[PDB]
Amino acid sequence: TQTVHFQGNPVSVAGKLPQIGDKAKDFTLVAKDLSDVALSSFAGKRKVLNIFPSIDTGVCAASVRKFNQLAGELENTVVLCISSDLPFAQSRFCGAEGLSNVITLSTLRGADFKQAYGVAITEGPLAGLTARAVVVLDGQDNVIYSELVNEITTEPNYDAALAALK
Amino acid sequence: TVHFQGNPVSVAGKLPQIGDKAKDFTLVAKDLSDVALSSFAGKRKVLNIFPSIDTGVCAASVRKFNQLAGELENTVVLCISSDLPFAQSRFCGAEGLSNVITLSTLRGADFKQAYGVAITEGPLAGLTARAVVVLDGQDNVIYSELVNEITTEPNYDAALAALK
């Protein structure tokens, strides 16, 4: 069981984030239209899994939208912005707003994903939400990049996530 | 069994009837803190339960009812949805109201079972059903309605009348 920080304060995160060389578990999550979307749906493609505590925000950092868009226009690649936000709140997100081959997914259903990818925050004011993380998967579900950011409010290594794509 | 345009939808458990005791719950406020039912000791509680309050335009009758119940003496209106405290702030029917507080399902899925509002079928599975439950000062149910159509308004007039 890992441990991260929100603004300095310790946050317990249940499970274990898939290491490089692991086979990532299949999941099913909720799309914007309330339709269900499985990881099996993208067989062969590369999957950038960008995990957020919340994407429900008016203000967006340029690097977030820059990372998502860049990885999105790479050949045979898809970006998945996942949070515990409801699909009604996920559609006001700048990092995925109008970004081609970048879709949002809610944990409204299939919330067991959180435990399976070691991103389930289980203590304090952020309980029921996900920990900030990026996980990059190859054509056949193998983890080629993974990072659990020690401080939640800070950003993951975007250059490195891109450099594995490659 | 409720209905969402169109066709039947299952709801786990069932709504507490008049005469029963409420059964304590804990949900999440807008500041992300924990708020328990027992924290409103002595007050009457209107539990206005929604599938989602995250919208930029509401029917205003929803705002009217919460305002009227909020105005009444020794009363607290608790608007409950599955929306996160980030999305509940937008709501056009609880905005800047006096005694109307929004509460989130985030880490209180235990409330959804104890009060029988958990939708388990269709595109709405994991969301909450439309229902109004009114409690007195001693947390006794004095009015309960589970609307069998999600796009349909509950009997506000009857809910208000039970407080009189």
Author numbering:
A (entry chain B): 2 to 167
B (entry chain A): 4 to 167
Article, verbatim:
Tpx constitutes part of the bacterial defence system against reactive oxygen species (ROS) and, correspondingly, is upregulated when E. coli is exposed to oxidative stress. Atypical 2-Cys peroxiredoxins are functionally monomeric, in contrast to the typical peroxiredoxins, i.e. the resolving (Cr) and the peroxidasic (Cp) cysteines (C61 and C95, respectively in the case of Tpx) are situated on the same subunit. Tpx contains three cysteine residues, two of which (C61and C95) form the redox active disulphide bond. ypTpx has a regular thioredoxin-like fold: a seven-stranded β-sheet, with β2 and β6 running anti-parallel to the rest, although with an inserted N-terminal β-hairpin (βN1-βN2) absent from other peroxierdoxins.
The redox active site of Tpx is made up by CP and CR (C61 and C95 in ypTpx, respectively). There is a conformational change between the two states, involving the partial unfolding of helices α1 and α2, and a shift of 8.4 Å for C61 and 5.1 Å for C95, respectively, as presented in Figure 4. Rigid body modelling of the oxidised Tpx crystal structure against the SAXS data, using BUNCH, based on a single chain, and imposing P2 symmetry yielded a model similar to that for the dimeric crystal structure. The binding pocket is mostly hydrophobic with one hydrogen bond proposed between the ME0052 p-hydroxyl to the ypTpx I153 carbonyl, which fits with the chemical shift change for the neighbouring T154 amide. The chemical shift data indicated significant shifts in the amides of residues from both subunits, highlighting the importance of the dimer interface for the generation of the binding pocket and compound binding, as illustrated in Figure S2A.
